[PDB]
Amino acid sequence: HMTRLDSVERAVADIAAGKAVIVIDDEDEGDLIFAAEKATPEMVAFMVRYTSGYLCVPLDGAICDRLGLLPMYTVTVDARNGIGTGISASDRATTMRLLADPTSVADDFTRPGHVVPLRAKDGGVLRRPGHTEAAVDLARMAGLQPAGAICEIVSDEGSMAHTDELRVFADEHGLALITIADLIEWRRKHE
Ligand SMILES: [Zn+2]
Ligand SMILES: [Zn+2]
User: Fold this and answer.
1) Going from the N-terminus, what domains does the chain have, and what CATH number goes with each?
2) Which of 62, 109, 115, 134 is most buried, taking the most CB atoms under 10 A from its CB?
3) Distance (Å) from CA 46 to ligand 2 centroid
């Protein structure tokens, strides 16, 4: 059988509406992805529920330069101000939104923390076909700050089987399911 994939257009519209999507790369693996600026306690709580471990914030290179995250997971951050210990859904949502804020600088944050910033390659999935790049691409395509929030979904037995389970899971929560391959193809034709 061939499992249904959503259109990239639907994934982008979900991202814009502040919803999450699931992105597969036919290379490893599905990640849950939303735009970092759209982080809420409820969406972080949802991500935390299904994360294999880390919650990451893919960032455009220009953001990383501004934050001092040079090309040179050991960097973790929390928002310095307006949070508890940094681990709550609400705290992590604040941290994520701050990372997407076009005026944030290193000292708006503390180290160590509960969110992992990641540097996306310039050019996005056209340059490097990774989940990190896809997240930034989707946020930017949605008209948002070029900053995403990602996690690997807890898996673990078979290839065809992974995709079918992801499709059901997506549908139970109203999420779009796409591949990086389709994102590449869309971008290439719509850029
Ligand atoms: Zn990945
Ligand atoms: Zn739900």
Assistant:
1) 1-191 (3.90.870.10)
2) 134
3) 7
